[PDB]
Every structure is written in structure tokens, then in C-alpha cells.
């Protein structure tokens, strides 16, 4: 394949005994281990759930450490086209990674949920709607939808979506939540929001709590 394999991590539900799957998608400069930590507070409430977190296919070239799903031109000093390419390629890799994990867990699409952060959220909102089969749901923390104009045309699947954003975010503007949110609604997605009041570019306890509820319902 031209496909790139993603290294990853896993918990907590025992290998072979998972009844649902959630995949964490980390942000620019981080790695899977970062978000996979979220498994600690979530697992007791999602007993049958397996949690997986891949590292993005490329090292963060500007950061100097950690990984990126694609470079960020204005921050990275990379070309916008090289960035757009990384994004499309990274989506295919992630698409494949998903199929692989669902196999090893022996689960079907509707038992899978995506939980992203930043750049991870952008990857989730891009890949899921373009998969053949509708997944359980998506939780996107702060939070941007690439190319909202192409959503209606390219949406094969329309899983429920919960957007969670901090109203003091200096990195990704809080206004983006409404942008993503309106476009998902108009494209026919069942769309929910949660506002982390006072919160910047980060995941607050209240946001995490609402995500958990959303996940416990949508998940088997």
C-alpha cells in the first residue's frame, strides 16, 4: 500500500472482550499517549469499551517533537499545498487504521466513536462522513471543520456529532464551533454543542463529562 501504518496504544477493556471502540485523535505536537490518558477517568464508566490512540503518521517538523496529522503552513513554514496533501493522505491512513482496529476487536462500524482534539478533531470530522458505514458518533474538542462547502456533496455517512469548544480559545476561535456546527446541521447531521465557559484551548471537566454521556448512549 502507499498506506502508512499507525503505531498506537490501547486500553482498557480486555483484548477480545471489547463491546465498543473509541479512538482518540491527538493534536499538533502531541501523540497518542497524551489523549490515551483520558482512558483512566472514562474506562470505569465505559466497562466494555476499548480505547485506542494512534500517533499521527508524521513527526511534527516544526515542533521538534511529537507528531502531526499534517503541517500547519502559517505556523510551520510549510507550503499550503504540501499541507493539503498531508491532510488528504493522513485521512486515508486514518481511514485504514480504523478498519484494522475494528477487525482486531471484531466490531462493526456502529460500535466505533471518534474523540478528537484540535487537529485531531479536524481529522475526525473529515474521515467519518466519508466512510461507507455510519459510526456511533464523534466528539470534537476545539475543533475545526475543513472545507465545510464540500460536506453536503461528500457526506456518505452522517453519524451524530458533538462539538465541544472553549469560549476563550486563542488557538482555534470559538466562532469556528458555530461554523462547523451550522454546516453539519445544514448537511443533515444530528448536531450537538457544548460550551466550556471560561475555557481556552483545552479539555475541561464539564466538556469531558458531557462527552462521556454522549458516548455511553451512542456506544454499545
Ligand X SMILES: OC[C@H]1O[C@H](O[C@H]2[C@H](O)[C@@H](O)[C@H](OCCCC3CCCCC3)O[C@@H]2CO)[C@H](O)[C@@H](O)[C@@H]1O
Spatial CA neighbour of 122 closest among 154, 76, 88: 88
* Of the candidate residues 15, 132, 153, 170, the single one contacting a copy of itself (CB under 8 A): 132
Here's the x/- map for ligand PIN, 81-110, by CB under 6 A: it reads as: ------------------------------
Report how far residue 104's alpha carbon sits from residue 189's, in angstroms, rounded to the nearest whole number.
Answer: 29
Q: What are phi and psi of 40, to 5 degrees?
A: -60, -55
Shortest distance, CB of residue 205 to ligand PIN, whole angstroms? 18
- Beta carbon nearer to a copy of itself, 62 or 84: 84
- Beta carbon nearer to ligand PIN, 48 or 59: 59
Contact 59, 19 (CB under 8 A): no
Shortest distance, CB of residue 115 to a copy of itself, whole angstroms? 19
* Of the candidate residues 32, 54, 57, 66, the single one contacting ligand PIN (CB under 6 A): 66
**In Å, how far are 71, 143, 180, 198, 218 from 173, measured between CA atoms?**
19, 9, 11, 13, 28
- Beta carbon nearer to ligand PIN, 30 or 162: 30
Give the Cβ contact number of residue 47 at 10 Å: 11
Q: Is the dihedral of CA 85, 178, 168, 36 positive or negative?
A: negative
Footprint of ligand PIN on 129-168 (CB under 6 A)? none
Q: Among ligand X, ligand PIN, a copy of itself, none, what binds residue 118 when CB lies within 5 to 8 Å by partner kind?
A: ligand X
Instruction: Based on the shown chain and the rule CB under 6 A, indicate whether residue 60 belongs to the binding site for ligand X.
Output: no
Instruction: Based on the shown chain and the rule CB under 8 A, indicate whether residue 2 belongs to the binding site for a copy of itself.
Output: yes
Q: Which residues of 56-90 are buried (b: 16+ CB within 10 A; e: fewer)?
A: bbbebeeeeebbbbbbbeeebebeeeebeebbebb
Q: Which stretch binds a copy of itself (CB under 8 A): 54-62, 78-86, 178-186, 205-213?
A: 78-86
* Of the candidate residues 33, 43, 63, 96, the single one contacting ligand PIN (CB under 6 A): 63
Instruction: Based on the shown chain and the rule CB under 8 A, indicate whether residue 99 belongs to the binding site for a copy of itself.
Output: yes
Report how far residue 18's alpha carbon sits from residue 51's, in angstroms, rounded to the nearest whole number.
Answer: 9
Amino acid at each position: 500500500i502507499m498506506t502508512r501504518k499507525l503505531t498506537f496504544g490501547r486500553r482498557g477493556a480486555a483484548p477480545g472482550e471489547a463491546t465498543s471502540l473509541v479512538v482518540f485523535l491527538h493534536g499538533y505536537g502531541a501523540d497518542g499517549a497524551d489523549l490515551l490518558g483520558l482512558a483512566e477517568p472514562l474506562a470505569p464508566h465505559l466497562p466494555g469499551t476499548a480505547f485506542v490512540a494512534p500517533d499521527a503518521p508524521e513527526p511534527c517538523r516544526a515542533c521538534g517533537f511529537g507528531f502531526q496529522w499534517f503541517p500547519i503552513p502559517w505556523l510551520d513554514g510549510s507550503s499550503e499545498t504540501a499541507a493539503a496533501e498531508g491532510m488528504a493522505a493522513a485521512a486515508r491512513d486514518l481511514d485504514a487504521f480504523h478498519d484494522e482496529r475494528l477487525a482486531e476487536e471484531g466490531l462493526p462500524p456502529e460500535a466505533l466513536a471518534l474523540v478528537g482534539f484540535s487537529q485531531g478533531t479536524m481529522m475526525a470530522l473529515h474521515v467519518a462522513p466519508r466512510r461507507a458505514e455510519e459510526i456511533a458518533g464523534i466528539v470534537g474538542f476545539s475543533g475545526r471543520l475543513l472545507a465545510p462547502e464540500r460536506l453536503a456533496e461528500e457526506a456518505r455517512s452522517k453519524p451524530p456529532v458533538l462539538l465541544v469548544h472553549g469560549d476563550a480559545d486563542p488557538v482555534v476561535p470559538f466562532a469556528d464551533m458555530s461554523l462547523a456546527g451550522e454546516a453539519l446541521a445544514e448537511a443533515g447531521f444530528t448536531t450537538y454543542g457544548h460550551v466550556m465557559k471560561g475555557t481556552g484551548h483545552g479539555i475541561a471537566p464539564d466538556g469531558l463529562s458531557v462527552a462521556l454521556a454522549f458516548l455511553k448512549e451512542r456506544l454499545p
